[PDB]
Amino acid sequence: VLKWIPRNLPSCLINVESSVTSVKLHPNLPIVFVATDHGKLYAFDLFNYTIPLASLQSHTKAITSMDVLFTNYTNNYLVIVTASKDLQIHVFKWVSEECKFQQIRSLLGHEHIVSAVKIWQKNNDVHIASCSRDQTVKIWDFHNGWSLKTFQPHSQWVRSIDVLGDYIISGSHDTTLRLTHWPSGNGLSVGTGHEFPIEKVKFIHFIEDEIRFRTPSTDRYKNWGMQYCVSASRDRTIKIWEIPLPTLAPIPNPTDSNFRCVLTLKGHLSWVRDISIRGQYLFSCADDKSVRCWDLNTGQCLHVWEKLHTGFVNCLDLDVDFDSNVTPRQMMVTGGLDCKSNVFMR
Amino acid sequence: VLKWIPRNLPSCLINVESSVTSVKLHPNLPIVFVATDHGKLYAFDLFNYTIPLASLQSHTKAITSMDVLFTNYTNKKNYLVIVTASKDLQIHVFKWVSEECKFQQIRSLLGHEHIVSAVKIWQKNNDVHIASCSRDQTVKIWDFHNGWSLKTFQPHSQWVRSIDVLGDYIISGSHDTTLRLTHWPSGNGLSVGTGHEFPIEKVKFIHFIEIRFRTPSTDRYKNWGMQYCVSASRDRTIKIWEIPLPTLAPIPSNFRCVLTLKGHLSWVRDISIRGQYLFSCADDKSVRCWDLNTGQCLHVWEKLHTGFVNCLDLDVDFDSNVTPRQMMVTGGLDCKSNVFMR
Amino acid sequence: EVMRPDIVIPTIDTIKHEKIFYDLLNSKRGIILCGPPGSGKTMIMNNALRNSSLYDVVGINFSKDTTTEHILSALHRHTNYVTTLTLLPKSDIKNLVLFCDEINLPKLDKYGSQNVVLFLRQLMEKQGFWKTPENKWVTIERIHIVGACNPPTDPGRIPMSERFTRHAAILYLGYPSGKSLSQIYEIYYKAIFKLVPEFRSYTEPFARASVHLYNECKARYSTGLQSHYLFSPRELTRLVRGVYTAINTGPRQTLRSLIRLWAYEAWRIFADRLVGVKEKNSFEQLLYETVDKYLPLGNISSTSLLFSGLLSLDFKEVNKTDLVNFIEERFKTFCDEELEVPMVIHESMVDHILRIDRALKQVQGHMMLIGASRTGKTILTRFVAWLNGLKIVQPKIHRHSNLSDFDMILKKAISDCSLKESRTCLIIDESNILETAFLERMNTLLANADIPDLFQGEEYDKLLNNLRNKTRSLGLLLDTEQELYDWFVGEIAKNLHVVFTICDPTNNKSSAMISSPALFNRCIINWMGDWDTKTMSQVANNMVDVVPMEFTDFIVPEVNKELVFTEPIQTIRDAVVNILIHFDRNFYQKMKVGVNPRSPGYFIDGLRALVKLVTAKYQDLQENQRFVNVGLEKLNESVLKVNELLDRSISLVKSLTFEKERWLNTTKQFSKTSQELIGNCIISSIYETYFGHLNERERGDMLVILKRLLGKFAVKYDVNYRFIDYLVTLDEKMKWLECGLDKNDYFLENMSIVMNSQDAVPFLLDPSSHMITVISNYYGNKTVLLSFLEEGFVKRLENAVRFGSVVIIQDGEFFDPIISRLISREFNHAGNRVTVEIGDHEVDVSGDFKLFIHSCDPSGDIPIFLRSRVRLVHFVTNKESIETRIFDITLTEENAEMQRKREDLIKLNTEYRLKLKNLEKRLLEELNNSELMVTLNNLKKEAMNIEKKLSESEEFFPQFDNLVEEYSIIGKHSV
Ligand SMILES: Nc1ncnc2c1ncn2[C@@H]1O[C@H](COP(=O)(O)OP(=O)(O)O)[C@@H](O)[C@H]1O
Ligand SMILES: Nc1ncnc2c1ncn2[C@@H]1O[C@H](COP(=O)(O)OP(=O)(O)O)[C@@H](O)[C@H]1O
């Protein structure tokens, strides 16, 4: 259920109006959400892919990234947020009765184009992260509609973020990584060793099923809850980083304020655009019209999807396996500049 | 999949400025192209039908026919090719730039001596050709790349009202009640067929699917690949013909009527076949659906438009690169279009 | 070990020269090594002094303008001032050798003497010199003066005084024999081919082929053709180094791959500097015959050899289509990220990108791009630097700038390269070198791995402090001065790449830039030149294949093959591209360019103007034809309804007979106007982008040339075509005439040219300075008048850009290069905000900001940057202007009331004509937008009233004709 490898050929070929920028998977129902460089936001069924279910033009500029969340409460719907080049973050609602996108509100506050967003629920409260070209990374409130904290962690503009509870690591254009504790709003460590701007950076969440890079090494790291990070840059390389433990709001250790490259994956022929982790594998896509599959234990590309698109490959994702609220289904969707979307099934 | 039955109620109501004449569907996108009697070409998004995606005053008079084709080049970027036939004695070839959602006029085909009534687009391995027919009793076939004419002949004494192309063979329906199968590269007729008493409206071929009419009889018909066809006129009757095998440059001899359909209350306008099912509208403000095996109507669609119903489009199901979407679009005289999805 | 420059093959001549040089140097005598460039004076010197643990080498490269202070500055970090004065070297065990290279290069004064040569004579004869500040005598103790110079027969070399050469022994070094060179590069090729042991038997044929190619290209391409055709064994060393790099960073090789790799290296080393296409063909045949003779394979043209590592992990030959697609996507990302510029990617652009990338990937790889303006040099350089992870640095050298600004910019760049290890590509245009001191600074920067006089004294000490801090930051174990400065120069050599952009190589300053010794021997010369006609065909087709052009019948003309530059003609688009290319060639030929490079900016601007103008004109024609057809159809339907079936409707129907016949005439003329649309658009674009700086006679001659070219390719055009009747409407003309324009057709044409340049700013050349007040009257009170000669112009311009007012900058011949971002329209977009970088801080463009540049001095100095990137328009007083102004003055002074009545009558008549045209347009719109009968009756009554008013007002024109016929003689005598 975990060591599944996609087949040589995609299960379906979804045609979109223009360059696909981001694709996301619904954690509950078999339906995929496809962004669009024209600014549209599509939603295609996993079995009837000829026609979309709902689509609308909300942004006047190119959508940069998006993600979804299946909310759960101890006291139940899908929330879609969508960044774009319009300096705006539009929040949508997915009603399952008539399968139509319901616009909730538009979130403002950025002085330049917004790149990445992150949404998560913490004790019946949901927060929306954001990072933009104005060098400001922000985490906002969905229910209140207002901002919560704003800070500038990087000297150049930030391109991608990822959250693990209250901790956020934000790669930027200055070829560096930085881990900042959001509630205190201060930097903790730096990641140096890349020579080209970071495309997408994300955490390595722990699993219990052995995988070398998804397990704690010491009891202190297990208590902290994070140890490693993975970052993809324009150096045609995927680097695994190690987070030094701070003084525990956490206080950065002055002699332990720098990262350490645990492993550096190489073999891509162009800029590594997007990365994802499933089990012991690291699914990644790049601009060489190819999709790799790096085994995390050995650091070797076991399967290469050569010429998957006739153009650049932009985004892909899997199901999150570290969360018990989402079943890790064996479905993979991959979009690209070819104005096509490829879904891999079974 | 191929046995989809359309729903009773129309789903999308598209409003335009004038009477809709020709409607064509995007083979890969949920985009509908609408042509009016004012010559304004309309591109309407299906999920936002209140405003068009892009509009263009393509022709200065009424557009008579339309066809689209998505190129598949073995080497070169593929793009959608849109052609329009109007009463301006000219044919315009467009290109849908889906990156920006705009109409890009590539070239125009000139030479017809009266109003063009029909077009047809097909692709070889690396060659795209454009066919046409008009009131000056000729069927002119052009080339998409170069732009000049490649063949010109007069198949009928009367003026051809509709044509269809299947490779190297052209069938022409005219104001005269007869049809004629004409070989393309040699420009010589092969067979004719009469039986109607009214001018012929729309004639198109019938393609084999791996069924009563989509299954070949013998191996000699398998080698040629054509056995039957469909045509209809103002006779309120749709007839299936049998194509005689000519003495194969093929050397030519009559059409055998193997099926007739009755039930339409006025002159029919369009013909479309979807697997085992046949779709056709008329001026009785109704859309009739016919089974291929039994040859009798299954469902009726009454009172869609106050005026006449002009055209239908259904996606081609015999093409590898064209996905058979469960969709169809129809146009009407009341400045209204109907879209049926799923 | 091929990359290491300290590797010398010991031959007989090498060991002989090294031993005699060492024996002369141990005799405490001056040494002057003579010989042609590339002989190996520096080579044998480094080989001799490398094995000795008691001599040190100090390298100074003399330029055209070299002073004693440069020699003193280059020695102050190696020597000490001890009063025992005495200029002892810093080391107590090792002596110091002062290598003075290119001694023949420092120029003579007005009276025929050299300061540096006399200083060196004082150094070796009197063993000291006089120190200028405190007027004291120093004594040189342990410094040996050794020189190296070319024979004086070479151009740029001056004879030397015998009083200086008397104290120095002279050793001559000629070129090695062809057999010796073959042996040397056979040893190098063995060292290279150790990487590929399965082709170990091909080392000698490759070396023989390379040496034969070098000898043949030296015999053919000599100095008599171009001044930069100086070939040397250094070219073969560069070829060997490129072969080693392309082998080491490549895949497993075969025979065809090896031969094509070597041929690509030969193309990039030898034939990159060739100017003429005939020399390129000669080199192509030379490579063919060399490979056939010595290496017993595909096409070996320049475009067919595309070796690059941009697509994979290895340096290998790649296809053109996938490379073009990759470069297109990467340039889309570049335009989104760094700088937005709409330029078209073609094959020559791809090849130039590949060779710039190959140059920049090297260590100490500097490049010198030579070509016409608006060819794509700085954008290509910035794009390649962005692809390689470099940081672009363009010095903001402007007017009222001195040595201190350039020195600070260079010091900041060096500090970033060394302390901050930021890899930097420095773009230096020929306009950033204001004085020869800048060129000398850059020559010293390129020859050595730093500039010595920029770090002297407390600046030198604080540089030592900064470098020591950074060295302890990396944890490197070094304490002495020499190791730290070696680290400094190594970091600068590794992390700095210099790019020179030259637009006019015939210019004297650019000629000195090219002929500089260190710039020539270090930079990789790329003579891009102008655009060959295939490149112009490619870019023209690629930017006109997106417009409606083929909407009419086209009969393919039967013309000569040599007169067609595109593919064989099948469509109107190819005919248009060939017409534009032919007119560009004819225009450059008839403007007497000579051998100067020809800027393709006029071609690109004409193409863009043609694109937008034909799009607008086709849309307008289609809309007008649709309106007139639906109007005629509505009239016919109304007539049929009236016939089938009320007095007001009958009167309205009967009152539209003239409108009906005019509409029928327009529908009839629609086909003729559609046939001639493309030619009219072409001629309009040529007027907009080509004829700005021309008088009436030259414009007429070039129009005749364009018309015969346009009829040659079977393209139709209006026989009575006129620029005023096509691009100038009545609204624009009346606004201009109320603003204060003259009644001249030439001035109206120029006003239409300057008011339709929405892309490039217009340059006004009006000696009378009347257009200043004209454009101030056009925009009212929002106009602001700036000048390049006034202090505080920068802040005023920035404030006007922020507010969005219309700016007219006077004195265009004193161009200030801080606004090069504004002239080139290299804006940056932040969502809905557009920002431009002026000076040092970016400012926001309001979107209503407009820029006009004015200069009242004809035959001024306009830099090739501004000249190429503006729509320069002349404003001269022709014969018609003289006659009109003389007539106006004599009528004002003879009968003022008559002149006032006449001008009021003309203004009233043209205003009524404009009102009638607007009334007709409103009538058509209201007819197509279907109480109404009364409205149309009122419109008809108003039109009849205007017609009657004009009929009454045309009763005074013969009197005006008699007056002008009476005063034509005084007008013609005045002119
Ligand atoms: N063993 C050798 N004998 C002769 N020439 C050699 C030998 N080894 C290298 N060379 C050539 O000598 C060149 C060095 O010349 P260089 O000293 O720069 O000339 P210059 O004295 O004019 O500065 C190298 O490019 C190399 O090709
Ligand atoms: N391949 C191309 N296609 C279209 N335009 C080009 C191309 N190359 C250059 N240009 C024009 O040249 C300008 C930039 O070149 P520029 O920097 O002026 O050259 P230079 O470095 O010689 O001054 C742009 O404004 C662009 O319009």
PDB file of N, CA and C and ligand atoms in Angstrom, chain C residues 341-346 349 371-379 429 501 503 531 539 543 604 608 824 826 865 868-869, ligand 2:
ATOM      1  N   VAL C 341      11.629  42.141 -22.098  1.00  0.00           N
ATOM      2  CA  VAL C 341      11.930  42.678 -23.422  1.00  0.00           C
ATOM      3  C   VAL C 341      11.382  41.732 -24.488  1.00  0.00           C
ATOM      4  N   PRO C 342      10.578  42.227 -25.429  1.00  0.00           N
ATOM      5  CA  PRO C 342       9.984  41.360 -26.470  1.00  0.00           C
ATOM      6  C   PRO C 342      10.885  41.146 -27.688  1.00  0.00           C
ATOM      7  N   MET C 343      11.828  40.218 -27.555  1.00  0.00           N
ATOM      8  CA  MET C 343      12.757  39.904 -28.629  1.00  0.00           C
ATOM      9  C   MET C 343      12.563  38.469 -29.106  1.00  0.00           C
ATOM     10  N   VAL C 344      12.855  38.259 -30.387  1.00  0.00           N
ATOM     11  CA  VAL C 344      12.550  37.020 -31.093  1.00  0.00           C
ATOM     12  C   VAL C 344      13.807  36.168 -31.162  1.00  0.00           C
ATOM     13  N   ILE C 345      13.665  34.878 -30.870  1.00  0.00           N
ATOM     14  CA  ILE C 345      14.792  33.954 -30.842  1.00  0.00           C
ATOM     15  C   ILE C 345      14.946  33.299 -32.207  1.00  0.00           C
ATOM     16  N   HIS C 346      16.152  33.389 -32.764  1.00  0.00           N
ATOM     17  CA  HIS C 346      16.504  32.854 -34.070  1.00  0.00           C
ATOM     18  C   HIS C 346      17.802  32.059 -33.959  1.00  0.00           C
ATOM     19  N   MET C 349      20.997  33.893 -32.977  1.00  0.00           N
ATOM     20  CA  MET C 349      20.898  34.179 -31.551  1.00  0.00           C
ATOM     21  C   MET C 349      21.238  32.951 -30.720  1.00  0.00           C
ATOM     22  N   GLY C 371      29.775  44.340 -32.692  1.00  0.00           N
ATOM     23  CA  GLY C 371      28.673  44.268 -33.634  1.00  0.00           C
ATOM     24  C   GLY C 371      27.943  45.588 -33.676  1.00  0.00           C
ATOM     25  N   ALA C 372      26.918  45.636 -34.520  1.00  0.00           N
ATOM     26  CA  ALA C 372      26.115  46.840 -34.646  1.00  0.00           C
ATOM     27  C   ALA C 372      25.229  47.023 -33.418  1.00  0.00           C
ATOM     28  N   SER C 373      24.694  48.230 -33.274  1.00  0.00           N
ATOM     29  CA  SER C 373      23.781  48.506 -32.176  1.00  0.00           C
ATOM     30  C   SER C 373      22.432  47.844 -32.429  1.00  0.00           C
ATOM     31  N   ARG C 374      21.722  47.557 -31.333  1.00  0.00           N
ATOM     32  CA  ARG C 374      20.430  46.864 -31.356  1.00  0.00           C
ATOM     33  C   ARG C 374      20.533  45.502 -32.038  1.00  0.00           C
ATOM     34  N   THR C 375      21.639  44.804 -31.783  1.00  0.00           N
ATOM     35  CA  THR C 375      21.824  43.433 -32.235  1.00  0.00           C
ATOM     36  C   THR C 375      21.516  42.419 -31.142  1.00  0.00           C
ATOM     37  N   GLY C 376      21.444  42.853 -29.889  1.00  0.00           N
ATOM     38  CA  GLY C 376      21.203  41.935 -28.798  1.00  0.00           C
ATOM     39  C   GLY C 376      22.480  41.450 -28.153  1.00  0.00           C
ATOM     40  N   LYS C 377      23.323  42.379 -27.707  1.00  0.00           N
ATOM     41  CA  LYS C 377      24.572  42.027 -27.042  1.00  0.00           C
ATOM     42  C   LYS C 377      24.424  42.015 -25.524  1.00  0.00           C
ATOM     43  N   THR C 378      23.920  43.105 -24.943  1.00  0.00           N
ATOM     44  CA  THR C 378      23.858  43.187 -23.488  1.00  0.00           C
ATOM     45  C   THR C 378      22.741  42.316 -22.920  1.00  0.00           C
ATOM     46  N   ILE C 379      21.612  42.198 -23.625  1.00  0.00           N
ATOM     47  CA  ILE C 379      20.544  41.320 -23.148  1.00  0.00           C
ATOM     48  C   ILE C 379      20.966  39.860 -23.247  1.00  0.00           C
ATOM     49  N   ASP C 429      30.326  48.866 -21.827  1.00  0.00           N
ATOM     50  CA  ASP C 429      30.096  49.373 -23.166  1.00  0.00           C
ATOM     51  C   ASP C 429      31.236  50.298 -23.578  1.00  0.00           C
ATOM     52  N   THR C 501      31.216  45.491 -24.729  1.00  0.00           N
ATOM     53  CA  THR C 501      30.217  45.714 -25.764  1.00  0.00           C
ATOM     54  C   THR C 501      30.670  46.880 -26.631  1.00  0.00           C
ATOM     55  N   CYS C 503      30.006  48.942 -30.241  1.00  0.00           N
ATOM     56  CA  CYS C 503      28.996  49.189 -31.264  1.00  0.00           C
ATOM     57  C   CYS C 503      29.574  49.735 -32.562  1.00  0.00           C
ATOM     58  N   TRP C 531      23.219  41.930 -38.975  1.00  0.00           N
ATOM     59  CA  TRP C 531      22.418  40.732 -39.185  1.00  0.00           C
ATOM     60  C   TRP C 531      22.494  40.322 -40.650  1.00  0.00           C
ATOM     61  N   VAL C 539      13.592  36.455 -38.218  1.00  0.00           N
ATOM     62  CA  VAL C 539      12.934  37.287 -37.211  1.00  0.00           C
ATOM     63  C   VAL C 539      11.702  37.977 -37.797  1.00  0.00           C
ATOM     64  N   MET C 543       7.872  37.314 -36.400  1.00  0.00           N
ATOM     65  CA  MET C 543       7.034  38.346 -35.801  1.00  0.00           C
ATOM     66  C   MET C 543       5.949  38.891 -36.728  1.00  0.00           C
ATOM     67  N   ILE C 604      13.583  46.253 -37.103  1.00  0.00           N
ATOM     68  CA  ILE C 604      12.701  45.748 -36.054  1.00  0.00           C
ATOM     69  C   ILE C 604      11.589  46.746 -35.756  1.00  0.00           C
ATOM     70  N   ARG C 608       7.547  46.113 -36.183  1.00  0.00           N
ATOM     71  CA  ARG C 608       6.561  46.273 -35.112  1.00  0.00           C
ATOM     72  C   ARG C 608       5.489  47.290 -35.485  1.00  0.00           C
ATOM     73  N   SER C 824      15.391  52.761 -23.397  1.00  0.00           N
ATOM     74  CA  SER C 824      15.239  51.393 -23.875  1.00  0.00           C
ATOM     75  C   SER C 824      13.965  50.724 -23.379  1.00  0.00           C
ATOM     76  N   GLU C 826      13.148  49.458 -20.519  1.00  0.00           N
ATOM     77  CA  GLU C 826      13.404  48.246 -19.741  1.00  0.00           C
ATOM     78  C   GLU C 826      12.760  48.387 -18.362  1.00  0.00           C
ATOM     79  N   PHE C 865      23.815  54.703 -28.818  1.00  0.00           N
ATOM     80  CA  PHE C 865      22.732  54.211 -27.972  1.00  0.00           C
ATOM     81  C   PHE C 865      21.451  54.995 -28.229  1.00  0.00           C
ATOM     82  N   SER C 868      20.245  54.884 -31.922  1.00  0.00           N
ATOM     83  CA  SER C 868      19.598  53.649 -32.339  1.00  0.00           C
ATOM     84  C   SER C 868      18.261  53.424 -31.644  1.00  0.00           C
ATOM     85  N   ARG C 869      18.068  53.956 -30.435  1.00  0.00           N
ATOM     86  CA  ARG C 869      16.885  53.610 -29.652  1.00  0.00           C
ATOM     87  C   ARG C 869      15.811  54.696 -29.636  1.00  0.00           C
TER      88      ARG C 869
HETATM   89  N1  LIG D   2      16.318  38.585 -32.049  1.00  0.00           N
HETATM   90  C1  LIG D   2      15.645  39.747 -31.883  1.00  0.00           C
HETATM   91  N2  LIG D   2      14.330  39.851 -32.172  1.00  0.00           N
HETATM   92  C2  LIG D   2      13.660  41.005 -32.010  1.00  0.00           C
HETATM   93  N3  LIG D   2      14.224  42.136 -31.556  1.00  0.00           N
HETATM   94  C3  LIG D   2      15.536  42.174 -31.231  1.00  0.00           C
HETATM   95  C4  LIG D   2      16.335  40.950 -31.379  1.00  0.00           C
HETATM   96  N4  LIG D   2      17.586  41.250 -30.997  1.00  0.00           N
HETATM   97  C5  LIG D   2      17.589  42.552 -30.626  1.00  0.00           C
HETATM   98  N5  LIG D   2      16.371  43.104 -30.763  1.00  0.00           N
HETATM   99  C6  LIG D   2      16.044  44.512 -30.448  1.00  0.00           C
HETATM  100  O1  LIG D   2      17.224  45.108 -29.915  1.00  0.00           O
HETATM  101  C7  LIG D   2      16.967  45.738 -28.663  1.00  0.00           C
HETATM  102  C8  LIG D   2      17.997  45.308 -27.632  1.00  0.00           C
HETATM  103  O2  LIG D   2      19.285  45.189 -28.226  1.00  0.00           O
HETATM  104  P1  LIG D   2      20.434  46.208 -27.758  1.00  0.00           P
HETATM  105  O3  LIG D   2      20.777  45.954 -26.319  1.00  0.00           O
HETATM  106  O4  LIG D   2      19.976  47.582 -28.173  1.00  0.00           O
HETATM  107  O5  LIG D   2      21.735  45.828 -28.617  1.00  0.00           O
HETATM  108  P2  LIG D   2      23.136  46.550 -28.297  1.00  0.00           P
HETATM  109  O6  LIG D   2      23.678  45.765 -27.129  1.00  0.00           O
HETATM  110  O7  LIG D   2      23.906  46.405 -29.585  1.00  0.00           O
HETATM  111  O8  LIG D   2      22.774  47.974 -27.960  1.00  0.00           O
HETATM  112  C9  LIG D   2      15.574  45.347 -28.215  1.00  0.00           C
HETATM  113  O9  LIG D   2      14.795  46.520 -27.969  1.00  0.00           O
HETATM  114  C10 LIG D   2      14.984  44.557 -29.361  1.00  0.00           C
HETATM  115  O10 LIG D   2      13.807  45.207 -29.850  1.00  0.00           O
END
